[PDB]
Amino acid sequence: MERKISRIHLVSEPSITHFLQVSWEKTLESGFVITLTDGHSAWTGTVSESEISQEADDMAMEKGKYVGELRKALLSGAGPADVYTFNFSKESCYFFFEKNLKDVSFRLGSFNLEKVENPAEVIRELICYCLDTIAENQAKNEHLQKENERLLRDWNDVQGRFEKCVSA
């Protein structure tokens, strides 16, 4: 069970950012669930193994390469030089992302999301997940810093004893 939250700039209104959370069990190959939000209303959708396999077959692409490209585009895996452009038609509830390639654009994925009646629940769940992960990271950092300080003190003591021994 893993989930990643990313920020995106929809071309329709490139002034206010949106947040997309994608969660998967083991890898994106089997499938995942995606949820787009902007702070007021949210949409949700799911992609299964059959859907991703069909999309890859339509692309005449290797499954591994397609999975890697999807991971790069959705999990904010921006490379040294690569731009991905996303857009979500609200009227048709159709969200699709393409790989802009310097005046030649290659559409990468497209799905139809359903407007969830309750956006408050999903926003609250996202906030709760963020708070949990930040607390866990803070605890891990504190523990690691304490361990590093203790190890540094021990190393200093051992170095001093070694200097004394070599002198004697």
């Binding site: 339509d58 692309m59 005449a60 692409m61 390469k65 490209e69 690569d82 790989k99 390639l101 005046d103 030649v104 654009s105 290659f106 559409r107």
Partner: protein, 228 residues
Amino acid sequence: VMEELEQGLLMQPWAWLQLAENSLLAKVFITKQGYALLVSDLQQVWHEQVDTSVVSQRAKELNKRLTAPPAAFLCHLDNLLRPLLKDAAHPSEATFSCDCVADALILRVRSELSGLPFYWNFHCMLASPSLVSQHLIRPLMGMSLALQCQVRELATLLHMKDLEIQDYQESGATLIRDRLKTEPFEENSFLEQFMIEKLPEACSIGDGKPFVMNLQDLYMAVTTQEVQ
């Protein structure tokens, strides 16, 4: 536009193409307005000229999901093809295949662009008698005549050198090294020896690789002179 593409194709050198155990000789000229292609296999010559509308339609039909202006498509095709044609043994990224229709030829090219598939298809009809003649026969004719003139000039130079060697031998000292002696040159004897011995291998066309590898500069010069 049309004349520009025709002239660009005419003033281009032949390149070697290897695809699925088959070999071809290809001339390509790309431009923002369209492209011209002339392929051959030493038995038949196919020519295809495509403008903006046709390239756009074919790209949309083949690449269902590649929206781009036709000029960008032409530029990408040029960037993909020209380096491969210019130099062989290039990093293998452009795969080619040829399907011989009863009348036409379908050349399918599949390549990678930033890790994404890129397909294109050349639908080449049989080259017109005038185009094939102007592109192969007359230029080859000029190269043959130019090489004959070169051989004649080299024979004259050999005659001068042989005369001067005779002058040295008539009044001169012995050779420091005797292994450097050379017999007098005879045009008839040399021609007969070459024809009898090395013509079978010298004239072996094979699949066309030696022609592109050896004397493309002479072909380009002859074609450029013919243009003027």
